[PDB]
RNA sequence: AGCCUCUGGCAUGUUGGAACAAUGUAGGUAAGGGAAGUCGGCAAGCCGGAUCCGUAACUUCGGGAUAAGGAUUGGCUCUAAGGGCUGGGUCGGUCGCGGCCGGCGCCUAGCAGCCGACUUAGAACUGGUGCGGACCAGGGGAAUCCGACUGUUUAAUUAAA
RNA sequence: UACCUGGUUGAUCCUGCCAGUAGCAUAUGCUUGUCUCAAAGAUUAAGCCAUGCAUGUCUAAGUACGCACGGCCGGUACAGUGAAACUGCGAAUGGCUCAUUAAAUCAGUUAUGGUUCCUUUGGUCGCCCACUUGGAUAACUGUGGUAAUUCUAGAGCUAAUACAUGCCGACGGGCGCUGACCCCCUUCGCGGGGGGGAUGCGUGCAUUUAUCAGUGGUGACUCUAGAUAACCUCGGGCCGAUCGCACGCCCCCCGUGGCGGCGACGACCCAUUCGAACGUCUGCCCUAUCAACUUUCGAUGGUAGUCGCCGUGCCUACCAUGGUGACCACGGGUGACGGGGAAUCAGGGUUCGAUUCCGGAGAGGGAGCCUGAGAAACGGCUACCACAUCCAAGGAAGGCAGCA
RNA sequence: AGCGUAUAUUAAAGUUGCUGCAGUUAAAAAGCUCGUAGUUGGAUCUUGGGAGCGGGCGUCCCCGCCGCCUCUCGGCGGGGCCCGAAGCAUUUACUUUGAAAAAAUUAGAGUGUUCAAAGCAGGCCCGAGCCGCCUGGAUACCGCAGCUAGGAAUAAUGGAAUAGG
RNA sequence: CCGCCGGGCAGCUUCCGGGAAACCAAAGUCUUUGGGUUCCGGGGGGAGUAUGGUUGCAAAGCUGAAACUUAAAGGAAUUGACG
RNA sequence: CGUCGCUACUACCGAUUGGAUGGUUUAGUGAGGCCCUCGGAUCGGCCCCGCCGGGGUGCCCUGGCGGAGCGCUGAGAAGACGGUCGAACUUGACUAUCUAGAGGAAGUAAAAGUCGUAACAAGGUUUCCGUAGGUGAACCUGCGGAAGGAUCAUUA
């Protein structure tokens, strides 16, 4: 099949290696996952060792995190943005390690709105007034008010994130191998990271 | 090759299950075990080749599957189960129980011990582990791991293991001044107190060793397994006591014992 | 400037960098806390490793590589690649017949971390055997000494 | 270039109507074979544009030479790659958004916005393998004879040596 | 044993060769009383092959209801030998040969902190079916084809450690964060301090991702270990909670509940053992009538990726424009599988090493494949090519470089 | 009891010459010169001397000593004591000692195989009442490269000079 | 004219020592074998041929094989003997 | 010594886009596997009803016999779209090796034919090198060389 060997290609100088053996079950290459975004679809593979390998071909959701806040709700991966390697993998919406992806904000919103109890985006008073104060309005007080006033200033977000939550989509980057692992795990692009990738996107579209 | 190799040619067979060129093509091959193939004694060689207890291979088959032979007090039916530095090998219907100490030439003895001294046993240590939840692990040279060791046991030291329990009972750090048998190379089954070791980064470390008579061999660390606090080996030694006599001396001393002996 | 030039973002992993809701400007003064290591065998992890703004995974003074085996030296002959040079190891291979030697050499491509500045050709350089790092390159430069010959 | 069209020009090149015979003169097309054809491949067709690949003997070392021999080529949706033009002297003072002074700045790695021709490369998708689809458009090779090459010549039968 | 003798010339001394000499290495020429050791179709043709064989396996311990035979004896399911069949292993070693292969095999040396590992050893294993739930095939029984094969049609049964499933367990008990809340001290009250909290959600050995802190271990952690947040590779993680033969017991106690030895398969974390693998440094035959090679068909490198077991131009994309060379590359050749050795030999070499020991490769040739820990496996198969058998002309079966 | 010829190959070959050939005439030194790789390259740098022990009042052979630095580093409220670290052996080349070197082969210990090629056993103790003793399965080499430790004879190589320790 | 000195062209002479010999201050320092280094020969012919490459306008130049055949060809000196 | 004469053997040149095998491969075509996307012989299970029976509180839990939605997950063959390694086949290129060949020209054998007589003696013309030109053949002649001479001198 589709081997992985130093056995065939030229030497440093530029002489052509002769063969040696046949291809052995060894220098074995399987074809790619080039995993998409759809309802979940993963085949197992039997590999060397015994052991197994979770090659994702359709993949919808990721277990993937704030840096700073120190959480990681499991969230839908909405859509691929740019992938530094190559610009088919964007268009085809192929998730691979260090793809930049849009995701659902919603599960991250909904634990400030537990924890520090201060909103995101900006709104007039439609969702906020029935439900945030349903998270707030205390009849315990004293201990708790002290507690998420100790969760002080620093229920704070960078403008760059604050923005995205209007939209209900966050920029994140894959750090697992969908084809090897079986998942599309990652971090949220946060702070410095977050600033090319916007400026890449902006400069790319023009 | 394709798989792993389940076979051993006589000749290729190491120098000490002491086999001869005629009589066969193959040698016995240690079945996989705790001890490395090259530093073994497959039980089979004791019986027919060392003790002349059996004669053939089938004679030995009929021995071990009566279930007499107990390699460290745990009964083996494998004719080719590997023994190696620091084992026991109790026969029980006989009451002999040997070790497996190597001679001064490095070729595993027929050295009988008491019924006592078949409980205590020695083992060098290969690593500290820290397994999980902070439960620390040893790895003895005979591939026992032993959980829950005294934290002062470090690497290359030896342990005075029991047997029926497993467990540990008191021990010898690897300082200067303690007693060493050598378990690899040339100075092999030769015995003496240390002196001084030479730490090198990267390449493995050298150990200078002085003996009774005053002959300094050195060795790589990974061959030295220790046997006492200093001029007091806890085990019984083989006759000769890993002193090693120059062929000149050995020749004459053997021959000088002769004539005067009667 | 300088650092993030390529396409993907280049960052020392095992430093997560952001958390800040306090005064004292914005971020620290080092700003990014820099992951570096001591390598071993006593070679001083140089100043520009620790000081440096820079980033190369294949540098042992600022990234994931282990040095672990055979330490050699050679001379720098070409610096026309980027983060790699070519060194040239000279010797006498001995014939026994002809009771004499002949000069030989096996030039050897080798990683050169850009911490390690002001290198030139005709430059004595010491190298560690590394992980098989590219196709040819298994070695990584550890201490340049510029020594024999010429000037400061 | 060819071929289709506006401006401008005609009204089919001294007649018309009706059929579609043979011979013709102009055009076309043929199963299988494929020069067997004649003095001879006489006419025609093969080739044909571009991009990519590729290239002989021989030599006057220029050539040969588009040698030879191959691949690709549509529509569509993309991507990538090729440029101009303007903008910091901000801070303080003072003078009338403007100037002047003085000070800091000094993108001197630039970045920001605003413009505008064109090209080229690559990737999907896609169509009964169609794509230089109309037209434009070198058949090739191995030899010998002659004449170094360009040119010229018998206006109305010889263009060649 | 450091070694020589014949031959050019009417005669001489040389250069120089020819010819002798001995061993070794292979031909066969003749002869052959004894006895001990002992090589053998390698060179040519990895050419071809008739036939005969070279790889099966049962303890007590995975199923056994063949009537096979007894038992010894039954009715209670067993009992005990036991032909078949499923299942688990092996078949991945060995054996053969050297076609290829010139830094390629391979030696020594080092690395794996750039990895996998059946087995053995050592360990480690408590979150309403468990008093085991379901279901389905082989032998077996019967009815079937085909000319023919180690070809099956089809109807009944019936097992399991084969295939699925999935429960007691543990403590409405304990500890992480949430907490309906509550009390006391202090305060004008806000507030400050001390407390205590029903009820939620969590309630892990492994997984992947994210973060945090700095018991033990190295020259060498970006390691082990620990803390927080998550997920489920999900049927295709594991254990989690697995099944046989010996059948031997004790109960503040009468029949239950506890207990005993053996095995088998699990397995997760792990170690270990046989390894396997891919790297380091340094090491080879001839040839210039081979001087430049290498590079959008990866050449060398950077970045980011895919694939794998893993680092890696293993592959893709985008960048750079590199790397080798007369210390002879690059090109060509070999009557080249590589070592360990051999016969020769004053010291130094010279050629041979297909040769039993080690290392490599291939089973007409390539490629791809299943299966498997482990193979790209040839005593498997899939075609093709290259070979070749039987034929009822529809079809079928072919691989000696196992031994003969 | 072997002995013949077939040819490959080694000595013989001081006829491939490193050791170690040859170049007036015998086969043979470019027509001459320049010149990049290569090979090759003067001299010159710690010594005489000291202190002792030991052979042949002193003289003349023969040995351990006067690697330096560090103590910035360990420790076998202020310590020493010096090992632990490194300046590191300028940077090698060189030499010597270790360690590592699969067995078989080889070299070669041991052994009435009846000898020998071989074999690795055998030997013994024993009238067998011992109901059993005793010993082996020696060692050297194992290129180059790699690893370790001594030495500094020679060969390169380095350091202060538009100033620096 | 008579000396000396450096380096030049040369001569004679000799049992240094070389040298098969002729001869040679050097062809000396060589089995008492190696100061440095360049080239280059390995019986004679075939053959400086064929072929290949290259330079040249070309004569040709440079690089440069084999099958085959062949026993001596040759060198230095001795007597001869014939010019 | 050479042409010339005859015979024998080698290799050479040689018109023949001469033939054969091997190795690369440019171009096309491309078996089968492998992956991906579909598919869906079928086979269930879940279920929904009709009727009936046993157990429980018209309803539920089991059982029996019928029917139907074939609702919705599972398994799931044949098959098909794509992609990847890729033997194989077809046409070019190179290089390797090996050979067929009308006729032409050397050498050698080799060794006793004819015509001379080039060389060795002052070889009758000192010899030889290189170059050139010539010639039946050795050859000859220019020019410049050489002595390996037939003169180490020519007698201020
Ligand atoms: Mg020599
Ligand atoms: Mg008309
Ligand atoms: Mg008109
Ligand atoms: Mg026709
Ligand atoms: Mg005709
Ligand atoms: Mg025409
Ligand atoms: Mg032409
Ligand atoms: Mg003309
Ligand atoms: Mg005319
Ligand atoms: Mg003689
Ligand atoms: Mg004679
Ligand atoms: Mg001879
Ligand atoms: Mg094998
Ligand atoms: Mg291992
Ligand atoms: Mg050949
Ligand atoms: Mg065959
Ligand atoms: Mg194979
Ligand atoms: Mg195969
Ligand atoms: Mg076979
Ligand atoms: Mg010879
Ligand atoms: Mg000799
Ligand atoms: Mg000679
Ligand atoms: Mg001269
Ligand atoms: Mg001479
Ligand atoms: Mg000499
Ligand atoms: Mg010759
Ligand atoms: Mg002459």
**Tokens 């707030």 sit at which residue?**
A136
**Does residue B255 lie in a domain region?**
no
The reply to whether B202 touches chain C by the CB within 8 Å rule is yes
Ligand located closest to C99 CA: 1
Q: Do A131 and A173 belong to one domain?
A: no
What residue of C is the nearest CA neighbor of A99? C8
The shortest CB-CB distance from C21 to any of A153, A192, A200 is to A153
Q: Which chain C residues contact residue B201 at CB under 8 A?
A: 40-41
What residue of C is the nearest CA neighbor of A10? C135
Chains B, C: CB pairs < 8 Å: 6
CB B110 within 8 A of CB B91: no
Query: Does A31 contact strand H, using a CB cutoff of 7 Å?
Result: yes
- Expressed in angstroms and rounded, the spacing between residue A14 Cα and the centre of ligand 7 is 37
- Expressed in angstroms and rounded, the spacing between residue C97 Cα and the centre of ligand 20 is 17
Pairing of strands C139-144, C101-111: parallel
Q: Do B7 and B75 belong to one domain?
A: yes
Q: Do B104 and B3 belong to one domain?
A: yes
CB A174 within 8 A of CB A101: yes
Pairing of strands B82-83, B41-42: antiparallel
Chains in contact with C, counting 3 or more C-beta pairs less than 8 Å apart as contact: A, B
Q: Do B5 and B56 belong to one domain?
A: yes
Per the structure, the complete domain to which residue A3 belongs is given by 1-30
Q: Do B151 and B77 belong to one domain?
A: no
Q: Do A98 and A175 belong to one domain?
A: yes
- Expressed in angstroms and rounded, the spacing between residue C104 Cα and the centre of ligand 1 is 20
A79 Cβ contact partners less than 8 Å away, ≥ 6 residues apart = A37, A93, A101, A102, A169
Q: Do A187 and A164 belong to one domain?
A: no
Per the structure, the complete domain to which residue B5 belongs is given by 1-116
Find, among B235, B116, B227, the residue nearest to B171 by Cα: B227
Q: Nearest nucleotide, C1' to the C-alpha of A3?
A: E314
Q: Which chain B residues contact residue C41 at CB under 8 A?
A: 201-202
Q: Do B45 and B103 belong to one domain?
A: yes
- B123 CA, F49 C1': Å apart: 59
Q: Do B106 and B7 belong to one domain?
A: yes
Resolution of this entry in Å?
3.8
Find, among B224, B180, B183, the residue nearest to B206 by Cα: B224
The values of phi and psi at residue A186, to 5°, are: 180, -175
Find, among C123, C129, C128, C130, the residue nearest to C144 by Cα: C123
Q: Which two tokens stand for residue A84?
A: 């530094």
Find, among B59, B70, B112, the residue nearest to B93 by Cα: B70
Find, among A103, A117, A39, A40, the residue nearest to A73 by Cα: A103
Find, among C146, C139, C103, C100, the residue nearest to C122 by Cα: C146
Taking the C-alpha atoms of residue B35 and residue B55, their distance in angstroms, rounded to an integer, is 25
The values of phi and psi at residue B76, to 5°, are: -120, 130
In this structure, the number of other CB atoms found within 10 A of the CB of residue A199 comes to: 10
**Does residue B228 lie in a domain region?**
yes
What residue of B is the nearest CA neighbor of C69? B202
Burial of B172: CB neighbours in 10 Å, binned 0-12, 13-18, 19+: buried
The reply to whether A197 touches chain C by the CB within 8 Å rule is yes
Q: Do A101 and A48 belong to one domain?
A: yes
Q: Which chain B residues contact residue C71 at CB under 8 A?
A: 202
């Amino acid at each position: 099949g589709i081997s992985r060997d130093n056995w065939h290609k030229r030497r440093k100088t530029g002489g052509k290696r002769k063969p040696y053996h046949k291809k052995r079950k060894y220098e074995l290459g399987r074809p790619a996952a080039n995993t998409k975004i759809g309802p979940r679809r993963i085949h197992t593979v039997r590999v060397r060792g015994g052991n197994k390998k979770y090659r994702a071909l359709r993949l919808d959701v990721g277990n993937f995190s704030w840096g700073s806040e120190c959480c990681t709700r499991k969230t839908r991966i909405i859509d691929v943005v740019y992938n530094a390697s190559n610009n088919e993998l964007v268009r085809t919406k192929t998730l691979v390690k260090n793809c930049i992806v849009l995701i659902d904000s919603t599960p991250y919103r909904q634990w400030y709105e537990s924890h520090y109890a201060l909103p995101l985006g900006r709104k007039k008073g439609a969702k906020l007034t029935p439900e945030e104060e349903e998270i707030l309005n205390k009849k315990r007080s004293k201990k708790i008010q002290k507690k998420y006033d100790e969760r002080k200033k620093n229920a704070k977000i960078s403008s760059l994130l604050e923005e995205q939550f209007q939209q209900g989509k966050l920029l994140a980057c894959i750090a697992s191998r969908p084809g090897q692992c079986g998942r599309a795990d990652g971090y949220v692009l946060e702070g410095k990271e977050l600033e090319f990738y916007l400026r890449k996107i902006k400069a790319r579209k023009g | 090759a394709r798989g792993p190799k389940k076979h051993l040619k006589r000749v290729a067979a190491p120098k000490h299950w002491m086999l001869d060129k005629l009589t066969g093509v193959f040698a016995p091959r240690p079945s996989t075990g705790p001890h490395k193939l090259r530093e073994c004694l497959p039980l089979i060689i004791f019986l027919r080749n060392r003790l002349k207890y059996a004669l053939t291979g089938d004679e030995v088959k009929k021995i071990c599957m009566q279930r007499f032979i107990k390699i460290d007090g745990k009964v083996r039916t494998d004719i080719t189960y590997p023994a190696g530095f620091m084992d026991v090998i109790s026969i029980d219907k006989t009451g002999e129980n040997f070790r497996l100490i190597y001679d001064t030439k490095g070729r595993f003895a027929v050295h009988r011990i008491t019924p006592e001294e078949a409980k205590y046993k020695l083992c060098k240590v290969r690593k500290i582990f820290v397994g999980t939840k902070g439960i620390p692990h040893l790895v003895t040279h005979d591939a026992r791991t032993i959980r829950y060791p005294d934290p002062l046991i470090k690497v290359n030291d030896t342990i005075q293991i029991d047997l029926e329990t497993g467990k540990i009972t008191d021990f010898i750090k690897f300082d200067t001044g303690n007693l060493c048998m050598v378990t690899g190379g040339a100075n092999l089954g030769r015995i003496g107190v240390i002196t001084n070791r030479e730490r090198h980064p990267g390449s493995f470390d050298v150990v200078h060793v002085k003996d009774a008579n005053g002959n300094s061999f050195a060795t790589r660390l990974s061959n030295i397994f220790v046997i006492g606090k200093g001029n007091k080996p806890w085990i019984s030694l083989p006759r000769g006591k890993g002193i090693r006599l120059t062929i000149a001396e050995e020749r004459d001393k053997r021959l000088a014992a002769k004539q005067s002996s009667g | 400037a300088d650092i993030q030039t390529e396409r993907a973002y280049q960052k020392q992993p095992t430093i997560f960098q952001n958390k800040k809701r306090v005064l004292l400007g914005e971020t620290g003064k080092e700003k990014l806390p820099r992951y570096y290591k001591n390598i071993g065998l006593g070679f001083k992890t140089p100043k520009e490793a620790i000081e440096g703004t820079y980033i190369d995974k294949k540098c042992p003074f600022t990234g994931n590589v282990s040095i672990r085996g055979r330490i050699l030296s050679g001379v720098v002959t070409k610096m026309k690649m980027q983060r790699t040079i070519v060194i040239r190891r000279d010797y006498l291979h001995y014939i026994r017949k002809y009771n004499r030697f002949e000069k030989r050499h096996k030039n050897m491509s080798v990683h050169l971390s850009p911490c390690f500045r002001d290198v030139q050709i005709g430059d004595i350089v010491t190298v560690g055997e590394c992980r098989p790092l590219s196709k040819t390159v298994r070695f990584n430069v550890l201490k340049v000494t510029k020594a024999a010959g010429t000037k400061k």
